[PDB]
Structure 1
Amino acid sequence: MTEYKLVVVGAGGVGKSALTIQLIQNHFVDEYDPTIEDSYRKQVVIDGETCLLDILDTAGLEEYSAMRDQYMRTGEGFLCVFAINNTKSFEDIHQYREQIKRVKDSDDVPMVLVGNKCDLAARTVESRQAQDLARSYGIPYIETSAKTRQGVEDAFYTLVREIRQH
């Protein structure tokens, strides 16, 4: 069956893993649990096609360097996550975008900018900032909350259709 090799990328503490686990296990993880590397496979039906989603949940900070080079070359599409109440996480998005471009030899790699934690009133990144960024990269911008499940299948299905249309 069709498999789509997805990787969730972004700064430490932005909700990469809580996003991933709301999709696969249907619940919010409210605690401190930093990732090294975690892999999830789930058979799912998207727009009538049977497929398997093979998600690689990555570390934010780490000694991950060209140890990131390795998962970035096998990933077919990328969720690039930041948190809307953390301005620094938003500036680091550029970092992840160029390093993805570098290793894939491509300027057009399947990608969606995800602004997570939208349930929180304490926003420091305006939607318009991120909308314009995502438009400069030729990329979709979707806001999510791993807390309320607002936008999580959206962000992930949108990325599977980007890989389709590539």
Structure 2
Amino acid sequence: GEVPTFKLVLVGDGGTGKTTFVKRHLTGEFEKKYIATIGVEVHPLSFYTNFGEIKFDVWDTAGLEKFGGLRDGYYINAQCAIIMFDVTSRITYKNVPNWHRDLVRVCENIPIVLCGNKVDVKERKVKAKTITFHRKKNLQYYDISAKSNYNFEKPFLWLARKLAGNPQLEF
């Protein structure tokens, strides 16, 4: 009988590494063929902390193919979300404020951390001084590694901090 239950909804444009992100958090491997992620799926994941193993919910929301618009339905009752962006294109960065406006019209405050995938490439387009929107909009930022699994647990640790607020939550 585990008491701490927390639903997590991931947000981002389709085909932006979200499926790879969740599948790497499942077992830690990359699958080569690209399939446009459609629909939604649940991946019950429990991670170890000082309070034991804590279970979490996953919502594999993606796919701008269906005629019917249901993208806004998943946004209800969610208390946490994570945002992606690509480092090789300006469109993701200029779409970040659109994601900000839609999330704020969803809820007035939700802990959100800016995260950008596909950093394993040796050449990097989005140079660091460009990344200033989150600071002035009061959004926290972590980085993710596509190979070394850097920040594999620490974004979730930050999520745990915001869930509890007591700084004694450790690995």
Partner residue in 2 for 1:149: 149
Maintained 8 Å contact 1:45/1:51: yes
| TM-score of the two chains, using structure 2 as the length reference | 0.82
Q: What is the alpha-carbon distance in structure 2 between the residues aligned to residue 23 and residue 127 of structure 1?
A: 26
Looking at CA atoms only, which structure, 1 or 2, has the larger radius of gyration? 2
1:101 to 101, 104, 115: 104
Tell me the residue number matched to 1:81.
84
Aligned match for 1:48, one of 51, 59, 72: 51
Q: Provide the residue aligned with 2:41 in structure 1.
A: 38
Q: Give the drift of 1:112.
A: 0.7
Point out the structure with the larger helix share. 1
User: Would the alpha carbon gap of residues 17 and 129 (structure 1) be closer, same or farther in structure 2, given more than 3 Å must change?
Assistant: same
Bigger strand fraction: 1
CA RMSD of aligned residues (A): 2.3
Q: How many residues align?
A: 163
Asked whether the equivalents of residues 84 and 116 of structure 2 are also in contact (C-alpha less than 8 Å), the reply is yes
Give 1:80 shift.
Answer: 0.5
Gap runs ≥5 in structure 1? none
CA deviation digits over 1:79-108, x for unaligned, max 9? 01112122211211222221111122x0x2
Q: 1:22 — aligned with what?
A: 24
List alignment gaps of at least 5 residues for structure 2: 166-171
More relative contact order, 1 or 2 (CA 8 Å, 6+ apart): 1
TM-score, with length taken from structure 1: 0.84
2-side partners of 1:82 and 1:64: how far apart? 24
**CA shift for structure 1 position 23:** 1.1
Give runs of aligned pairs for residues 115-134 of structure 1, distance below 5 A. Answer: 115-130=116-131, 132-134=132-134
Distance 1:121 1:64, change over 3 A: farther
Instruction: Show CA shifts across 1:14-54 (max 9, x none).
Output: 21111111112221233302212222111222343542110
Q: Which amino acid aligns with 1:11?
A: D
Say if 1:84 and 1:123, in contact at 8 Å, map to a contact too. yes
Q: Which amino acid aligns with 1:19?
A: F
